[PDB]
Design a protein around this ligand. Structure first.
Ligand SMILES: CCCCCCCCCCCCCCCCCC(=O)OC[C@H](COP(=O)([O-])OCC(O)COP(=O)([O-])OC[C@@H](COC(=O)CCCCCCCCCCCCCCCCC)OC(=O)CCCCCCCCCCCCCCCCC)OC(=O)CCCCCCCCCCCCCCCCC
Ligand SMILES: CCCCCCCCCCCCCCCCCC(=O)OC[C@H](COP(=O)([O-])OCC(O)COP(=O)([O-])OC[C@@H](COC(=O)CCCCCCCCCCCCCCCCC)OC(=O)CCCCCCCCCCCCCCCCC)OC(=O)CCCCCCCCCCCCCCCCC
Ligand SMILES: CCCCCCCCCCCCCCCCCC(=O)OC[C@H](COP(=O)([O-])OCC(O)COP(=O)([O-])OC[C@@H](COC(=O)CCCCCCCCCCCCCCCCC)OC(=O)CCCCCCCCCCCCCCCCC)OC(=O)CCCCCCCCCCCCCCCCC
Ligand SMILES: CCCCCCCCCCCCCCCCCC(=O)OC[C@H](COP(=O)([O-])OCC[N+](C)(C)C)OC(=O)CCCCCCCCCCCCCCCCC
Ligand SMILES: CCCCCCCCCCCCCCCCCC(=O)OC[C@H](COP(=O)([O-])OCC[N+](C)(C)C)OC(=O)CCCCCCCCCCCCCCCCC
Ligand SMILES: CCCCCCCCCCCCCCCCCC(=O)OC[C@H](COP(=O)([O-])OCC[N+](C)(C)C)OC(=O)CCCCCCCCCCCCCCCCC
Ligand SMILES: CCCCCCCCCCCCCCCCCC(=O)OC[C@H](COP(=O)([O-])OCC[N+](C)(C)C)OC(=O)CCCCCCCCCCCCCCCCC
Ligand SMILES: CCCCCCCCCCCCCCCCCC(=O)OC[C@H](COP(=O)(O)OCCN)OC(=O)CCCCCCCCCCCCCCCCC
Ligand SMILES: CCCCCCCCCCCCCCCCCC(=O)OC[C@H](COP(=O)(O)OCCN)OC(=O)CCCCCCCCCCCCCCCCC
Lengths: 92, 109, 178, 93, 50, 116, 51, 231, 359, 149
């Protein structure tokens, strides 16, 4: 930096070092809080696909999954039977 | 609108287009065959070639709309008739000029 | 929605609340148009405060047009705004919203007094001169008077013809599959 | 709208799932309940929630002490040899 | 007279004591920010019931 | 320390908070509005990259154009302030007392209230 | 406009302590839209292979 | 979004459907062979136990304190004007002490937090010990809220606004009966849904449904009054 | 791309024709005063360089082209589907909304023409702005995606800002006391400031909502959004209630700031104070018949799949607005304030009706 | 018998004759007339122009004179040259609108929406269950404005 000393005399490191440190500490604490506690809680992956889920949300999700699977299976079976009946009746 | 078949059919891919002439020709042929069969429930397997042509030519949404319209038409045909509807509409329009006074001291219920 | 041996019966028209909302919007627009036409017929610079409602104390047509427009905005029964408010309350009852009916009624009565209080200011010691002068004489616009008269007729007798407007609005809304 | 293009002018990776979901929605009379599989596949290809859950589980397992040494990969023969066996390409040798 | 009319009149007057007749830019922006933040806060409070 | 998605989602609203917080000087608010538009630009680019969405990527130039038009309007309004005799510091356009201002003091344009 | 650079004499501490610090604290506590995005170094880079 | 979901649950319907029930114990049962640390840590299910009067009272107190702190953050502190000398002294404290902002926040929010906690705890105890087993739920909610908010407005705000407090309490009680103790926008059942019990044949069920439809026909005014044209 | 079907752009021809005619005539009127007199030309009368043209002809042109558009709508035929890359929807309800907006604009233009014939205090630029607003505002109901809706509403907002800019400022009144004294009126600046910043807030919040809707669902089309939300509710796959609630809150708050509903109303009061009566006459029509109607349709038709979140937000907003205005509406002392608060009260009532409908 | 011949100068009046008050048909509903070209491009639509479209243009030209004068009657402080230019602009706009209407009529004839001279081999006939207008139209002038199978 040409005339680096004259340029950096006023603000070598920071204008308000205390405030800069408070900003850094707040950022660090908030990132720690979010990543460690808050986002994991919202994600709710601790008991994901657990055979015996102790969390109401996970139990509801598994209930939805099994109910959808049962609905799809039943409708597929019924549609297959209906198509077979229609094909049989066609050749009469 | 998530439950609306009409809007879900109105949805389409960015590059999708419908060949209405060909689809309607195939559908007319298939429905003529179905009418010739003249069964209570439309059994498409009784018209294999025309059914395949109709499926190839027409889109799923168009086919769904056509089947629903056919069901409604079948129900209307089973229920009413042209002369009956004409007479009923004429009678109702004639009645509309008069008033519907309450029936006091009824006997039923 | 009722089920009898897999036969669905629907005695409710889903595309009715939208029709009622459209009716309310149209009624408010009509009444706003009436009041604004009354204002535009006169000189605009006079009306700058609620006290200046006395400036409407002009010949009978303008005076009573303003009075009835204010009453219609308030929601007095015979006038047009009552149709919209009553139909909104009827639809709320149909949907079984007693708390919504309560809050609607609170807002309606507060707004009713808000509109009505200006009738007190409408009283003037003498007759105002709010008409623009053209060719040394006040300029009265026959076209705007005719439009105000049509709006007044509809404001007075909207209840009689409301069935046709309701039919048209329900017909328009039925195209929406909701 | 779903343009269906990639970031280099190609095809969006979710285009097949989107087409399947739209076809099912159009065909079915009860699309919400009869297109659950296709819609879930499309949502998975879009969001990747299941893979994130799998990664979370794998991270927890790795944190747990169960794995010591994975088998080496003999690339010449496209085979896997146990880490115990010594090979010329082995790092420790 | 009082418990039916003066009550509401005094309520309105006392509320208007705390309302600025003329809007200012600081109040406009602060009200917008307060709505944005606290509607979200109250909705999340309803969602969670911490 | 923070994932990019969360970082940008938070900093957009933080920028809005700064815009509201800073003293209401039209030029400063205009600069903060430009910064908010650029934050939206960056967030849209991030989401477009994540989801392979050419629409999200293309939102960039739309945001740039909208921001440019709004900035032109802001320049025009700031210049119009002079002809309309309004201080850029909007807080000085009203007589309401404000402890946030060290030297806010207005008097009626008179020399003596009592003559006799 | 404002060539000399002189600005309004404004004290931000009053508003910072009255309205902004607690509101920001609450917003930070209750605000997170990122659902399941994972930081780099969450898993070893050697597991990723698609690139 | 649901308010008070647990209380307004159809246990029979969820049981017949197989839907998970919010009334499950939700408890931890550490094994007798588990570690001492595991046994100690398994006690956290007490913090989930809902039949705990003191836990519930502290829960309500925390809710009230949070609400009061939010009110102070949003409207109360900004509306209240602090003396210039006091502001200067507290700013000097911030300058002369690290993290002075935290202590200033504590001092400013202590009144609101404390009053909110007290209001929440007292309200929970009031509603639970009294009005919990009344016959008319709507009337009980209205009267309880009216009295509580009347007293609260008389004490916290001003004794001269107790009538407005009572009116606001009546309104809040009606709102709470509408959207807290009742499920208007939180429906978890289809309208008209039911369950079948007993060994009735499908033919018998269809015959009964036909009879029900015949009865339902009488609802229509035209058929009941015999005012239909011959179609 | 091999074949460009006429079905993709048939509907754009009338609007483009109207735009061309409007702008060509506007440029001709702008350059109207230029008429060279050749040295061999003879003037029957001395030219009157001072001219103040009445905009009655502009208003009549607007009425004529609106009537032609009405004729096009009446004679319109086609299939119910989307055109031009699924960005615009073409169905009976949307076309009826377009026709209703056009009819109301035509009637209001007729009344405005009569008023202008009565007295002229408005320039040709004012009615050119009105022409642009009338041409571009009914196209909103043809929006098929939130992206195109945002762009159309931004264009309409720019047109309305143009209309406010071209408001008359100084009048030749009968007050002869202020000839040599400075009188300060801040109404113009207040209107411009509040409109500009409300537009900024609404635009940024709507863009944020659009970005997050794209993140949640691959597209931003109404039908796809609703289908994906309903299927997500069925499957329980995506269950970030915080994200869904925040998206809904951002959308609702953006529209609240845009419209000027009870929580944020004071800027609307200031704008009404600073606007002329004719400007209010047109703005109330535009607002109620388009902006508020689309706001209602967001909960009724477009984003109906998200009503499980919208209901609580709407209820809270309505309650707060009612309890906030109950006392304010009795503190005003201005005609413009009275009109604005009438609009606000009607908006609150319609919001309550919308809640009842979405129930 | 109910609609003017599509090849005549009055064939453009069929735009006002509609079976139902709807704007557009449903996605799947067959057009009233056989489809000539569903995927019609600009060039083919122009090639499909007809005496009906020419008559529509002529109607636009004839009706643009009174309308242009009506628009001009609200003009003041205008020179003769500017007045004539404004009249020319308005008349040209009306004629361009007529051209657009003719283009739309050609598109409709191609798609089968309006009478294109062809008829489906088998008509899909409705059942007039709801009839509030048959007798009214028969006894009134509006029977001309509606098309009935
Ligand atoms: C229950 C609640 C109900 C609420 C109702 C709300 C509305 C009420 C008030 C307004 C109603 C409309 C009034 C007519 C328009 C105003 C202008 C006018 O005609 O008077 C000036 C003109 C004055 O002439 P003048 O004094 O000799 O000379 C004037 C100037 O010197 C020289 O004049 P000029 O040269 O400058 O201009 C002459 C030209 C001036 O005319 C105009 O420019 C008209 C301006 C308005 C245009 C919009 C009209 C829309 C009509 C449709 C319905 C909606 C109405 C919305 C109204 C409010 C919108 C803000 O005159 C005309 O040609 C007038 C024709 C009017 C009929 C227009 C019909 C258009 C129909 C289009 C839609 C068709 C349906 C399509 C379906 C699509 C399906 C796919 O009046 C007359 O010539 C007759 C006056 C006396 C009779 C008036 C009869 C009015 C009947 C109204 C029926 C309303 C619908 C039915 C009832 C619905 C509820 C049950
Ligand atoms: C991520 C975004 C933010 C990043 C950081 C900021 C940078 C970007 C700024 C732009 C964004 C908007 C900023 C607007 C500022 C408004 C005005 C203002 O305050 O600034 C002017 C203020 C004065 O400026 P100045 O006049 O130039 O400077 C004069 C002095 O030099 C100044 O020095 P000073 O010492 O006087 O000032 C220190 C300043 C900054 O504060 C600090 O010194 C650092 C604070 C670090 C947080 C410590 C709390 C514990 C963290 C735990 C984390 C891990 C938890 C894990 C959970 C696991 C569970 C399983 O203190 C405060 O702001 C006071 C509040 C700080 C405490 C926050 C407490 C939150 C939790 C409370 C929950 C409820 C407790 C109930 C009672 C419990 C009793 C047992 O400027 C600064 O000092 C620099 C800016 C700092 C902004 C801080 C904003 C507050 C957020 C703090 C972190 C929140 C963490 C939440 C998650 C964890 C919860 C446990
Ligand atoms: C209003 C009811 C709801 C209140 C909610 C808030 C509760 C706070 C927490 C509990 C406080 C415990 C009691 C301590 C005193 C508190 C009060 C106090 O200090 O105030 C200052 C002053 C007493 O302080 P002091 O003069 O310095 O000396 C006090 C001695 O130190 C006194 O000390 P001492 O050594 O003489 O001993 C006093 C002994 C005396 O024990 C008793 O006698 C208490 C049991 C009997 C009372 C039961 C309640 C009333 C039931 C009847 C309800 C009737 C309603 C009918 C409605 C009809 C419909 C309109 O109490 C104790 O020391 C036992 C303490 C044991 C621990 C309690 C654990 C509490 C945990 C929660 C703490 C909360 C912290 C946050 C609080 C702040 C934020 C909200 O008291 C008052 O000003 C109270 C004024 C009461 C009204 C005026 C009374 C005369 C005129 C008659 C009016 C009739 C109106 C009837 C209703 C409306 C009809 C239209
Ligand atoms: C590329 C260009 C190179 C050439 C540039 C020119 C070089 C020569 C001049 C450089 C300095 C500028 C002139 C200063 C003149 C005034 C001297 C003075 O007052 O003191 C200066 C400064 C004084 O700073 P200060 O504290 O007064 O800063 C506040 C300034 N005011 C008062 C205006 C608000 O000395 C120091 O700060 C020294 C101690 C802190 C140094 C920085 C520590 C943190 C950053 C480095 C970390 C390194 C790694 C260790 C950390 C952990 C890592 C894992
Ligand atoms: C929009 C609708 C508005 C509704 C307005 C509601 C009115 C609110 C009035 C609030 C009054 C103040 C709070 C009262 C709290 C006590 C209520 C109570 O005990 O009733 C519960 C019990 C609980 O009832 P329950 O629930 O077991 O049985 C209800 C029975 N049926 C179904 C028939 C309704 O109710 C009653 O026995 C009284 C019911 C009527 C309310 C009577 C209020 C009396 C108030 C004066 C009391 C005076 C006491 C003595 C002192 C006299 C002066 C010296
Ligand atoms: C069996 C054989 C049948 C053969 C039929 C052959 C004829 C077919 C065409 C018939 C046309 C009938 C008249 C149409 C309207 C004429 C309007 C006119 O000239 O008024 C000038 C007038 C101009 O004014 P003016 O000429 O009345 O005088 C103005 C005088 N001052 C100013 C003093 C008051 O137009 C207007 O005022 C309209 C202004 C608004 C714009 C309205 C546009 C309407 C467009 C209509 C297009 C045509 C629709 C045809 C529908 C047919 C349905 C079957
Ligand atoms: C809210 C804002 C308003 C509404 C929304 C705005 C919508 C914006 C999007 C509009 C998209 C329109 C795309 C149309 C593309 C097709 C055009 C077309 O029909 O072309 C058919 C024809 C092609 O017809 P074709 O497609 O049948 O040809 C191919 C035929 N086969 C396949 C058989 C070989 O196009 C051309 O030949 C010309 C192409 C364009 C050439 C360049 C024109 C530039 C014009 C610049 C402006 C000039 C102004 C002059 C003014 C004079 C007076 C002052
Ligand atoms: C080329 C293609 C086209 C693109 C062209 C791009 C053009 C870019 C133009 C850049 C202009 C730079 C010069 C002007 C800005 C200089 C910085 C400045 O003004 O600082 C303001 C602000 C902090 O200000 P304050 O808190 O008062 O303290 C100042 C401390 N420097 O500053 C901040 O906010 C933060 C400043 C951080 C400074 C960091 C200094 C690092 C020094 C490193 C020394 C060498 C060792 C490097 C080791 C790296 C290890 C990984
Ligand atoms: C919520 C939606 C609806 C909104 C509209 C309003 C709804 C009101 C519902 C309740 C109405 C109760 C009747 C009285 C209301 C007004 C209050 C009142 O009369 O009591 C006040 C009086 C104390 O007066 P004081 O404090 O000196 O003066 C006020 C100082 N600021 O006395 C007190 O100290 C209060 C004592 C308790 C109140 C007892 C009231 C008993 C009334 C019995 C007869 C009338 C019954 C009418 C209703 C019948 C049922 C419908």
């Amino acid at each position: 930096v040409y005339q680096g000393f004259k340029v950096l005399r006023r603000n070598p490191t920071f204008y308000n070092p205390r405030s800069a440190g408070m900003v850094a500490l707040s950022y660090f604490a908030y990132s720690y809080y979010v990543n460690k506690y808050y986002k994991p809680q919202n994600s709710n992956f601790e008991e994901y696909n657990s055979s015996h889920p102790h969390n109401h949300d996970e139990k509801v999700r598994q209930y939805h999954e099994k109910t959808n699977q049962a609905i799809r299976d039943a409708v597929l079976e019924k549609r297959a039977e209906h198509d077979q009946r229609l094909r049989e009746e066609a050749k009469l | 609108m998530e439950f609306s078949n009409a809007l879900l059919s109105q949805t389409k891919l960015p590059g999708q287009q419908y060949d209405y002439k060909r689809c309607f020709q195939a559908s007319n042929t298939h429905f003529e065959c179905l009418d010739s069969i003249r069964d209570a429930y439309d059994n498409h397997h009784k018209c294999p070639q025309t059914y395949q042509a109709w499926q190839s030519s027409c889109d799923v949404g168009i086919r769904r709309y056509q089947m629903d319209n056919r069901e409604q038409q079948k129900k209307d045909q089973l229920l009413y008739s042209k002369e009956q509807l004409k007479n009923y509409n004429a009678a109702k329009n004639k009645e509309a000029y008069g008033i519907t006074a309450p029936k006091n001291l009824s006997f039923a219920f | 929605m009722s089920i009898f041996s897999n036969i669905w019966i629907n005695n409710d028209l889903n595309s009715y609340g939208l029709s009622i909302l459209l009716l309310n919007i149209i009624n408010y627009l009509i009444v706003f148009m009436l009041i604004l036409s009354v204002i535009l017929l006169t000189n605009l610079s006079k009306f700058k405060s609620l006290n200046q409602f006395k400036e409407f104390n002009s010949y009978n047509f303008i005076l009573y047009s303003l009075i009835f427009s204010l009453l219609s905005m308030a929601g007095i029964p015979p006038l047009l705004g009552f149709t919209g408010k009553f139909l909104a309350i009827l639809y709320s009852s149909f949907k079984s919203q007693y708390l919504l009916i309560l809050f609607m009624t609170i807002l309606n009565i507060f707004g009713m007094y808000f509109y009505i209080q200006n009738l007190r200011f409408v009283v003037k010691k003498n007759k105002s001169s709010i008409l623009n002068y053209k060719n040394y004489y006040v300029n009265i616009n026959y076209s705007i008077t005719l439009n105000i008269i049509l709006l007044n007729f509809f404001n007075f007798f909207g209840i009689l013809f409301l069935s046709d407007l309701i039919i048209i609005l329900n017909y328009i809304s039925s195209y929406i599959y909701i | 709208s779903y343009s269906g293009y990639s970031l280099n002018g190609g095809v969006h990776p979710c285009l097949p799932f989107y087409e399947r979901m739209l076809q099912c929605a159009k065909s079915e009379a009860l699309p919400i309940k009869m297109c659950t599989a296709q819609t879930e596949d499309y949502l998975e290809c879009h969001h990747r929630k299941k893979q994130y859950a799998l990664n979370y589980a794998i991270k927890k397992e790795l944190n747990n002490i169960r794995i010591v040494a994975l088998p080496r990969y003999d690339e010449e023969n496209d085979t896997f040899v146990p880490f115990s066996q010594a090979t010329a390409d082995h790092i420790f040798q | 007279e009082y418990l039916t009319k003066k009550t509401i009149d005094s309520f309105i007057f006392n509320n208007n004591r705390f309302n600025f007749i003329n809007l200012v830019e600081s109040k406009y922006f602060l009200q917008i920010l307060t709505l944005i933040l606290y509607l979200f806060f109250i909705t999340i409070f309803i969602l969670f019931y911490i | 320390m923070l994932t990019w998605i969360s970082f940008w989602s938070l900093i957009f609203w933080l920028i809005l908070i700064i815009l509201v917080l800073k003293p209401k000087n039209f030029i400063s608010i205009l600069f903060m509005s430009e910064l908010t538009w650029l934050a939206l630009y960056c967030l849209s680019l991030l989401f477009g990259a994540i989801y392979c969405d050419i629409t999200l990527l293309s939102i960039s130039f739309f945001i740039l154009g909208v921001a440019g038009l709004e900035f032109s309007f802001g320049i025009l309004i700031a210049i119009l302030y002079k002809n309309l005799n309004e201080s850029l510091n909007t807080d000085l356009n009203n007589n309401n007392n404000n402890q946030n201002i060290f030297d806010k003091n207005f008097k009626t344009p008179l020399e003596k209230i009592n003559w006799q | 406009l404002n060539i000399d650079g002189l600005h309004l004499k404004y004290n931000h501490n009053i508003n910072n302590v009255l309205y902004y610090t607690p509101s920001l604290v609450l917003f930070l506590i209750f605000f997170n839209i990122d659902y399941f995005s994972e930081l780099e170094l969450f898993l070893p880079l050697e597991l990723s292979f698609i690139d | 979004m649901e308010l008070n979901s647990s209380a307004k649950e159809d246990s029979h319907y969820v049981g017949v459907l197989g839907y998970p029930s919010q009334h499950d114990p939700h408890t931890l049962h550490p094994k007798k062979h588990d570690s001492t640390f595991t046994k100690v840590y398994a006690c956290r299910d007490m913090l989930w136990d809902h039949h705990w009067e003191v836990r519930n009272t502290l829960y309500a107190g925390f809710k009230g304190a949070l609400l009061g702190v939010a009110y102070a953050s949003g409207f109360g502190l900004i509306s209240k004007t602090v003396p210039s000398i006091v502001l200067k002294k507290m700013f000097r404290f911030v300058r002369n002490n690290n993290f002075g902002h935290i202590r200033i926040m504590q001092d400013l929010l202590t009144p609101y937090a404390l009053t909110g906690f007290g209001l929440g705890s007292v309200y929970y105890l009031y509603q639970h010990n009294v009005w919990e087993n009344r016959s008319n739920k709507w009337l009980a909610e209205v009267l309880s809220n009216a009295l509580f908010f009347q007293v609260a407005t008389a004490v916290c705000v001003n004794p001269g606004f107790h009538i407005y407090g009572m009116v606001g309490g009546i309104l809040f009680g009606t709102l709470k009966y509408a959207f807290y103790n009742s499920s208007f926008f939180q429906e978890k059942e289809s309208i008209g849904s039911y369950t079948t019990f007993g060994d009735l044949s499908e033919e018998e069920r269809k015959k009964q449904e036909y009879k029900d439809y015949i009865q339902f026909l009488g609802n229509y005014h035209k058929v009941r009054n015999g005012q239909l044209v011959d179609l | 791309l091999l074949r460009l079907l006429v079905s993709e752009y048939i509907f754009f021809l009338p609007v483009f024709t109207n735009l061309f005619i409007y702008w060509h005539i506007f440029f001709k009127n702008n350059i109207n005063l230029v008429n060279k007199k050749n040295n061999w030309d003879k003037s029957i009368s001395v030219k009157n360089i001072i001219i103040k043209q009445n905009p009655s002809f502009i208003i009549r042109l607007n009425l004529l082209l609106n009537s032609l558009m009405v004729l096009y709508l009446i004679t319109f035929n086609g299939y119910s589907s989307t055109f031009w890359w699924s960005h615009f929807k073409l169905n009976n309800y949307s076309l009826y909304m377009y026709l209703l907006v056009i009819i109301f604009n035509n009637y209001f233009l007729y009344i405005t023409e009569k008023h202008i014939k009565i007295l002229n205090n408005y320039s040709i630029d004012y009615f050119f702005s009105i022409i642009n607003i009338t041409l571009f505002i009914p196209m909103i109901f043809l929006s098929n995606t939130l992206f195109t809706f945002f762009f159309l509403i931004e264009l309409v907002s720019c047109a309305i800002f143009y209309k406010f800019i071209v408001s008359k400022i100084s009048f030749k009144n009968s007050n002869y006391k202020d000839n040599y004294f400075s009188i300060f009126s801040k109404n113009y600046l207040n209107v411009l400031f509040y409109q500009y910043w409300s537009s900024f807030f609404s635009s940024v919040m709507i863009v944020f909502c659009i970005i997050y809707l794209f993140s949640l669902t691959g597209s931003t089309e109404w039908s796809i959004i609703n289908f994906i939300v309903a299927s997500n509710n069925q499957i329980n796959y995506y269950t970030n209630n915080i994200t869904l609630l925040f998206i809904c809150l951002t959308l609702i708050i953006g529209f609240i700031i845009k419209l000027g509903i009870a929580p944020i109303q004071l800027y609307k009061i200031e704008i009404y104070k600073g606007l002329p009566f004719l400007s209010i006459f047109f703005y109330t029509t535009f607002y109620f018949l388009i902006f508020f109607l689309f706001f209602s349709l967001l909960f009724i038709y477009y984003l109906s799949a998200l009503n499980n979140f919208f209901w609580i937000i709407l209820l809270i907003i309505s309650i707060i607005g009612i309890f906030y205005i109950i006392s304010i509406i009795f503190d005003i002392n201005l005609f413009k304030a009275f009109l604005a608060y009438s609009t606000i009260i009607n908006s609150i009532s319609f919001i309550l009706l919308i809640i009842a409908i979405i129930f | 018998s109910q609609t003017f011949a599509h090849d005549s100068f009055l064939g453009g009046l069929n735009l006002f004759k509609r079976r139902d008050p709807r704007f557009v048909l449903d996605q799947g509903e067959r057009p009233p007339y056989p489809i000539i070209n569903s995927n019609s491009s600009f060039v083919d639509v122009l090639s499909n122009f007809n005496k009906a479209d020419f008559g529509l243009v002529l109607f636009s030209a004839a009706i643009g004179f009174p309308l242009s004068r009506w628009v001009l009657k609200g003009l003041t402080f205008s020179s003769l040259n500017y007045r004539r230019g404004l009249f020319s602009s308005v008349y040209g706009g009306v004629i361009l609108w007529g051209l657009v209407l003719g283009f739309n009529n050609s598109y409709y004839r191609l798609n089968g929406f309006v009478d294109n001279g062809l008829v489906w081999k088998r008509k899909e006939r409705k059942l007039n269950k709801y009839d509030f207008t048959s007798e009214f139209e028969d006894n009134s002038f509006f029977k001309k404005l509606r098309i009935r199978d």
